[PDB]
Design a protein around this ligand. Structure first.
Ligand SMILES: [Zn+2]
Ligand SMILES: [Zn+2]
Ligand SMILES: [Zn+2]
Length: 178
């Protein structure tokens, strides 16, 4: 197994996947690494299994259909994985914890949002459809772009949104377009 966490790239107290060489901090994995379960298979492995059991699941889909899906166990897992892919980028630090807003010439967003809030909401089964999760994720970046205006720091929101959107298209097999 790897000797660093797949998510944060640090060493520490790591749990190792039994079916692939990845390792994780307990609360870096989503969902948090399960108490018992030997063998244990990471989220990467669980997602690969879904694909392998239903090869047709990789054919192109329309976003509007994906968003209306109910949060059954496989869609729950796919959103957990997508969230984890965002945490994998180090620039996610900016969006992880609860933000505050006090900048001359700007007003804070009406509905603040952040990664750890989305993580809690998934853990608590608060989303009934994929749309709920995707709307909160996109709200993170939209709030940031609006608040930072022409400051060059707005670019961090564009960057992490791009990671989100590329992973969304990959995990939910969105039909490729020009
Ligand atoms: Zn970690
Ligand atoms: Zn694995
Ligand atoms: Zn099948």
């Amino acid at each position: 197994n790897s000797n660093i966490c797949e998510v944060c790239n640090k060493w520490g107290r790591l749990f190792c996947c039994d079916t692939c060489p990845r390792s994780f901090h307990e609360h870096c994995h989503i969902p948090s690494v399960e108490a018992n379960k030997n063998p244990w298979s990471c989220i990467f492995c669980r997602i690969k299994t879904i694909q392998e059991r239903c090869p047709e699941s990789q054919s192109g889909h329309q976003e509007s259909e994906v968003l209306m899906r109910q949060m059954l166990p496989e869609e729950q897992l796919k959103c957990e994985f997508l969230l984890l892919k965002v945490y994998c980028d180090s620039k996610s630090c900016f969006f992880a914890s609860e933000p505050y807003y006090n900048r001359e010439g700007s007003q804070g967003p009406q509905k603040p949002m952040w990664l750890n809030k989305v993580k809690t909401s998934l853990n608590e089964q608060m989303y009934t459809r994929v749309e709920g999760f995707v709307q909160d994720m996109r709200l993170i970046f939209h709030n940031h772009k609006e608040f930072y205006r022409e400051d060059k720091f707005t670019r961090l929101g564009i960057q992490v949104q791009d990671i989100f959107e590329k992973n969304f298209r990959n995990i939910f097999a969105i039909q490729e377009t020009s």
